[PDB]
Amino acid sequence: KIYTKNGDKGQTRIIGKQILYKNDPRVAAYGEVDELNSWVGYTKSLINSHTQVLSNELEEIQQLLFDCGHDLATPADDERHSFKFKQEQPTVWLEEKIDNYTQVVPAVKKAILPGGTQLASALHVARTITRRAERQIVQLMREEQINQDVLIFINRLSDYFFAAARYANYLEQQPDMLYRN
Template sequence: MKIYTRTGDDGTTSLFGGARVKKNNVRVEAYGTVDELNAVLGIVRSISRDEKINEIVQTVQNLLFTLGADLATPFDVKSPKLKRIGEEDVKLVENFIDELEAELEQLKNFILPGGSFLSSVLHLARAVCRRAERRIISLSEVEKINEKVIPFVNRLSDLFFVLARYANKIEGVDDIKWGV
């Protein structure tokens, strides 16, 4: 099977359900940014030597595929093969955050992105996640979307922030305090 189909040569792509839209459609921007986030997480996994970080990130990468499919499928399209983001996914991310925060000192200052290389890439993931959230909100203003998607993505950016702090901790690097 060839990777190229030539069907997108006119600047359009297919959504789940069969509709074709322009590649700069707000829906495509939303799930495309989620794909970009997943690629950043691939970098995280390639440089991390920590089993806990890698397990969490791999779980999140799988959830991002679910999220991408959810966003690529208009809300009125139903399919028994489609899994949408649910409350259990939001809770899973919250549990990851709580588990990691239990191992960190309480945050008393704003911190700058950086520290270790791994932490820096996790901060990049956080920033890309926030952009995905903005794209998803734009989509939600013009089309109905799954109501669990925005809370899920909001929690993910919090998770990446906590993971960045955790990466600095395990690598023995201090977080960089803002203004200090």
């Protein structure tokens, strides 16, 4: 059964099987990445005919987030369990999308309100959940050795979600709204 009940008193296992409390900074870090991954799934479910071009990359992000979570759940000192996530290829992939979407949409010099279409608005929610997960990752980094490649990718990912949100509005001919002061 998926329910083992071993977590009923508030403790759980990480990779390698060491037991931690569920509020441990490590468990909060990969838990927030799981929350982000679920929100990306929700965002993907809002795609329509006008925004289908974004579907493949959202699913790829979900696969990458699983790799990131895996590494966050992995203690550095247990040599039986290696980190799997390498930032270079996925991060350059995000950057290419950021550059492309920044070029195509109307240039702004002011902050935008996070909103517009349902999909663009969901991409802004994704942007802010990514940044929340990043804060938890940094809390963990300050106490334990982490795969720093995960932090590089998670940082870049919220810039991706910002650029993708603007692109989603552009795909539905929805202008962005500027902050008034």
